[PDB]
């Protein structure tokens, strides 16, 4: 890879600089290079990896949605193949990013992750990137089941090994609830999961410091916001 000649520490330093400069494609390339050094990632490094790819794929998803909407309107005056071609171009690039992330998780981040905080983080990421693949899939059943399977494994570990206010556990439950509502056609499961997650976190807030309380309640508010949209 083009980052093979750069020191691991330099790649991490440059990923942080790229984040400050809002250069997320660069940030993702630096973090991919860091992962490919073969060492496990610290908590901060895992978050840099996630931030970088979330921003890259987030721009692709937003663009794909704009183009898919234009395409669907065209299929209700004939303008030729260009809308489909360009939607396909963006779609293929998005799928490539997702495959890259899934490849890093499979070779070899997940298999080396033994602590709950790292293993849950990576399995959640695996669910997330299969979910993004599912958003554009039309194959689709297998992709959905791969997302579900990853989220379910992450949920099982998180419930055994983490308190209900843990921000990773909360963000996992949040994203699995989104999977149920938006991907799996299971709005009742999404609502049930969001409610139970919110309520169990509420009951554990008393154990937290001021700073941890702030971290956990920020994510709980997203569960609440979705429940307001869904009910």
């Amino acid at each position: 890879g083009a980052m093979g000649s750069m020191e691991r520490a330099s790649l991490i330093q440059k990923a942080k600089l790229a984040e400050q400069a809002e250069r997320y494609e660069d940030m993702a390339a630096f973090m991919k290079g860091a992962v490919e050094k073969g060492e496990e990632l610290s908590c901060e490094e895992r978050n840099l990896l996630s931030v970088a790819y979330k921003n890259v794929v987030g721009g692709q998803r937003a663009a794909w949605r704009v183009l898919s909407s234009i395409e669907q309107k065209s299929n209700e005056e004939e303008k030729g193949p260009e809308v489909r071609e360009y939607r396909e171009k963006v779609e293929t690039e998005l799928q490539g990013v997702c495959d890259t992330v899934l490849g890093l998780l499979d070779s070899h981040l997940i298999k080396e992750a033994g602590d709950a905080e790292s293993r849950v983080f990576y399995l959640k990421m695996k669910g997330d990137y299969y979910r993004y693949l599912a958003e554009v899939a039309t194959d689709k059943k297998r992709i959905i089941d791969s997302a579900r399977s990853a989220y379910q494994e992450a949920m099982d570990i998180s419930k055994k090994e983490m308190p209900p206010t843990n921000p990773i556990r909360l963000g996992l439950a949040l994203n699995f609830s989104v999977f149920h509502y938006e991907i799996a056609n299971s709005p009742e499961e999404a609502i049930s999961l969001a409610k139970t997650t919110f309520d169990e976190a509420m009951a554990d807030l008393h154990t937290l410091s001021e700073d941890s309380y702030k971290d956990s309640t920020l994510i709980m508010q997203l569960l609440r916001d979705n429940l307001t949209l869904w009910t």
Partner: peptide
């Protein structure tokens, strides 16, 4: 669209 986890 539903809200997913933030950074």
């Amino acid at each position: 669209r539903s809200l997913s986890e933030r950074l």
